[PDB]
Design a protein around this ligand. Structure first.
Ligand SMILES: Nc1ncnc2c1ncn2[C@@H]1O[C@H](COP(=O)(O)OP(=O)(O)O)[C@@H](O)[C@H]1O
Lengths: 49, 49
């Protein structure tokens, strides 16, 4: 039936197309895209505000 | 509170866990049966915690 959530991850050497498939799926499902890097972030003001 | 014995997890998960997640996906038991045998294989092998 309805849409369902699940989280997913892709991993491998950089530049394998990970983000590229992300956006490709985003235009597949028709969902909106938005990147959000969190590598090395510490402050909580950029995540919760 | 303590931990849980391998068999003990079976009697938990068949009642207090499976129906809850069934309500998370919104299904009813009529279409998504999960036998005991699947549960014992799961807990015996795939999760030792
Ligand atoms: N199968 C593929 N089809 C199209 N582009 C690919 C493929 N494999 C790798 N690429 C390319 O690899 C690059 C990596 O981009 P992307 O996945 O967007 O970020 P990341 O560098 O994190 O993997 C893109 O320029 C993309 O065109």
């Amino acid at each position: 039936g309805s849409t369902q959530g699940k989280i997913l991850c892709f991993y491998g050497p950089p530049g394998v197309g990970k983000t590229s498939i992300a956006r490709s799926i985003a235009r597949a499902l028709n969902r909106e895209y938005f990147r959000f890097s969190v590598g090395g972030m510490t402050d909580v003001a950029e995540i919760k505000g | 509170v303590s931990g849980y014995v391998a068999q003990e997890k079976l009697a938990i998960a068949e009642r207090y866990l499976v129906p809850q997640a069934r309500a998370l996906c919104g299904l009813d038991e009529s279409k998504a049966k999960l036998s005991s045998d699947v549960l014992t294989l799961l807990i015996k092998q795939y999760c030792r915690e």
